[PDB]
Symmetry: C4
Subunit: 355 residues, 4 copies
């Protein structure tokens, strides 16, 4: 709610082209298709092949910044991103070689930050997941077995065994309801009453396990990144030790591209920013372009008013941001700083129009 | 649990009439329907047309309070709320012009506060949603592909391609279970075991992403609105800086209409209120009508008793409210204020019956 | 995890008998049923009728404690619990009068505490629910309409209208998957990709709205009840103001019936209790029966050991309970109290066997 | 996200063999199966029988550490793990005796820690679950009844009774959507609009009840275990009382097996560890093998750098772990300790290469 995400967060053309790349698959996969456009997109594989292949050797020129680097992840696919189609091209002379369009699917995941964040936590909590997944397997066959007890007699053809029943378990437990083969008797129909009751508590926990400390990591992700951009601010010599842990949970950083709008004038004042690197376009008769290491919005927050300036991203600014309460929290937290921000609430009145 | 929501929170007749307005659609949509009531409701479009159109020009008289205003949102539909039916009326001479009853559907959303609240946060967290939505597309085709591997042989007519399989993926992943086309082999049936396991963790996160800091915004929504109605209370010169952040998370404000009941006498005392604007009906031999900037309930909370007065909303009172713990928290937080509330617990014993 | 719930929490025979009472319905509801047991259970209605009717007039003798009472809720059904069957008995001379076995269903809800707790909060947060429920109706018809656009042509018989499509919306949105009528074209099949994506975020919020501050109320429910049983403890003259808010969130009270086990000897020490009313059976050569206002378990917690006594509920004891951390929190919170609990960890060594 | 789970957390071969053990069931369960491998796995039951039976008497030699022990849980199945197959072997002379492969299913649960953790909390919160489960039964028949009102007329064969309707309730309420028998009329089709709306709020709460304070227990599980491994650290004479409660929520302990990697050199520094028991392989010219009661990583965290040593688990080390913020929290929390860790950030520069 308090952040300006811009500059094409889904930027890298490596990440982009699997999507157009892999829809190229389908038309090959289909009868009654002319050959015209059939192979026309086979090029587009060759394009994406050649395109990543173009990118490829530039990467293999890894004498760049070659001091200490851990790039087994980033490289893992780039190798295979061209080889797997290639060996596929020949031995699988038949068109099915395109079935090695399973391959680029990691390329989005190549430069997918927030995926390490995902896999980071599973290697702390899977202890639970196992004891639950076991427990999932407990309750599965514990309950799956209860059906073969019954309808083997009059429904062999659907329930003539155990695993045919295990099928109808998790379909029944995991919230799904396919609807292919269903009981006819009473007591077997009774048993479902605990099933959804169970599974929705099972996943009531188990999916909750994920979001539980995932969010801890994500809410932690906004600190590990943001104990940086702290010392850069020239004011933070005075802040006490414990004060920051309160703060950085709320302070998110993002980056705006050049030209874009930051705060348009006259819009309702609802937040303030801490610039740390880049520069701005504070639209005044004399533009007060504050570069790395500044802020604005206090003129509107202390007064509770619209914007005092059409600030626009003159350059690519690594931004921060902040809503009132957390700034009121700061204003509440210390008279030492409200003094200068009060002065600033008068200086920037006289500094906005002036130089 | 601690608030009195009254005065028709779904008030504005602009917001109201799409519901009766759009059910007017259906009878046109249906064969074997007489023409009698068919067009009878076509009027009701004309009514709602004329009705908003009546409202319309009053809005276009936007010389009202014309100083600095940002009304592109509120106006966006009012323009189209009449034009789109209108141009539809002529070029679509055929009855299908009523299919521009897709149009009013924003009119509820026109004056839908809590919808900006919704859209506010997506422009902070969609970073995740993308990396997840990509990941959703990863796991989709990653898994969808695994089926065409198999049943293309014996189920062409259902699984004779890739996208027919992508269909059966999210139907299978997204908790649904349609039940149109289902495997017959083993290993393809095996694969589902991870699917629901996955998707319920996927949405185990992804839907959780929404409620995660949505609630932060909503729990923030009760501060940004309620750092107001703070200075109005004549007592709050003494409160310390940090004290309020604890409080305002709990203090919700609402507004009661005139005439309505606030606290009926003899009901079990469970909460107290801070009036800030309006007036009351404190039912005593001399009604102690406390207007803007007062409170009551302490007589019942400190004593832990039923109500001392049938207080009723004499006027439209912008209300606050408060449960005990948070007032006990305050009573715990300072002896400075319990003194006067103790005195008040004796003054209002003598002030209730007296003037 | 830290509480002993006993004494038949589903106690009241008023609450009990709807369950046996209403299963009495079914056998009447069924063809090919002999008349023998048919009416045999009609008695059981008459029993439950007579039984509550027996209870009834005792309630209508409401001169008991008749000072100030708010009993419209408790009485609302007891009136109807006998009348509705009664008038049903005659005018509905046909057996369908038993269809006024819809009636007792509130009787469990009559003496269902935790149901007021439910309905308490909806009158604070339904503001959201409306803006969401509207939004649910937005996204419903916003999306439902998109289908009649298409398959009216080739699927009139299933999609020959709007509301037939609204049907397939929430079935599709609300996680369900019935599986009666399904598209055949592409673009209409495309649209589902956002649907489950939506609804699982919708209810991703909306159901979350419930558990959100429900839990606040429930976690509040353990304070409003438990600022009581505080002064009774003879030790709590010294505790500081803010200290308790930390505590009472964790301290749950329950009540054990006479005879039952409290802590059996030799079991692993994992918790301690604060008795406030009732008496115990501390199994020692001289039973140290501590009555209202005492505690035990510190001998095992400070030492981290099994139990020092087979304590059993000699009477109906209104119990508290407590795990270590929260007691370590207290031991951490003050040296003033660990002294006496250290002494107690030696006194009760000498007081256990002795008198 | 901050922990190294290793040494075969799913270790015990007792726990292992039900999985291979119980899949042995299926081939017996199936027609058209040769007898060759049929009984070949009957051995594997005899193996697992004999194998646990081998383990068994070693357990029944419970003179080991025979002072005070509470082993009714661990023993409960080991008794039956061999008897139930055994008596099954004879009286059920027919092959169905293998249906006492329902029996080992507790054997995973035998040595399933985190299962007591599960069952611990249900005996605090089931108060709710009942009032909800009742409420589930309320809303069930409250709503189930509403259908027999209607389609008994034209759908006897599907809705010719009450319980046939109760079937279609929870299938409809519990998020499932089987799709066997569906209405045809309007008002009965209307009713579903509240159903999913309800059940997803029902389980919106009810499943949430589980994860609610489950997580409290789990987040508590990391304290009850970890107030241990506290005094062992020679430094913790100075820490203040309240300081630890902040900490131990974050500090998880796990155990690494011998040989395994702990921190490989040059990897990005992201965490530090507290060793308390075992020994390490700090790969330096003179290996600084710190045994029970030490730490490392500060050299990389204060500097924010890659690893200073390929530390590997020389022995089975009962590990702790810690990320930066929580260490920054400590560094923020006191100058008393950053001094020595600063010194350590120079000592271990000179102590790493040296002895
Ligand atoms: K479903
Ligand atoms: K289905």
């Amino acid at each position: 709610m308090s952040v300006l995400p811009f500059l094409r967060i889904y930027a890298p053309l490596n990440a982009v082209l699997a999507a157009p790349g892999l829809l190229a698959v389908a038309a090959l996969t289909i009868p009654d298709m002319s050959g015209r456009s059939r192979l026309a997109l086979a090029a587009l594989l060759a394009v994406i092949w050649g395109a990543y292949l173009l990118q490829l050797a530039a990467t293999l020129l890894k004498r760049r910044a070659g001091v200490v680097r851990d790039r087994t992840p980033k490289i893992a696919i780039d190798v295979l991103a061209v080889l797997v189609p290639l060996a596929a091209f020949l031995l699988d002379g038949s068109p099915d070689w395109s079935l090695y369009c399973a391959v680029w699917l990691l390329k989005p995941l190549r430069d997918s930050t927030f995926f390490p964040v995902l896999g980071r936590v599973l290697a702390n909590e899977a202890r639970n997941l196992i004891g639950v997944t076991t427990l999932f397997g407990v309750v599965l066959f514990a309950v799956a077995l209860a059906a073969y007890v019954i309808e083997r007699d009059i429904q062999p053809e659907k329930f003539g065994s155990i695993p045919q029943a295990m099928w109808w378990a998790v379909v029944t437990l995991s919230t799904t309801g396919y609807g292919d083969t269903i009981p006819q008797s009473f007591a077997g129909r009774v048993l479902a009453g605990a099933v959804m009751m169970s599974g929705i508590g099972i996943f009531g926990l188990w999916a909750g396990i994920l979001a539980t400390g995932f969010y801890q990591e994500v809410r932690r992700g906004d600190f590990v990144r943001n104990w940086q951009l702290v010392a850069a601010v020239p004011l933070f010599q005075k802040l006490g030790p414990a004060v920051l842990v309160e703060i950085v949970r709320a302070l998110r950083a993002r980056t705006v591209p050049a030209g874009a709008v930051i705060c348009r004038i006259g819009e309702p004042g609802d937040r303030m920013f801490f610039v740390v690197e880049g520069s701005v376009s504070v639209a005044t008769p004399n533009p007060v372009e504050l570069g790395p290491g500044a802020f604005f919005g206090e003129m509107a927050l202390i007064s509770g008013e619209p914007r005092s300036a059409t600030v626009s991203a003159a350059t690519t600014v690594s931004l921060l941001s902040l809503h009132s309460a957390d700034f009121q929290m700061l204003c509440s937290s210390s008279p030492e700083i409200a003094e200068i921000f009060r002065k600033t609430a008068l200086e920037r009145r006289g500094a906005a129009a002036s130089a």
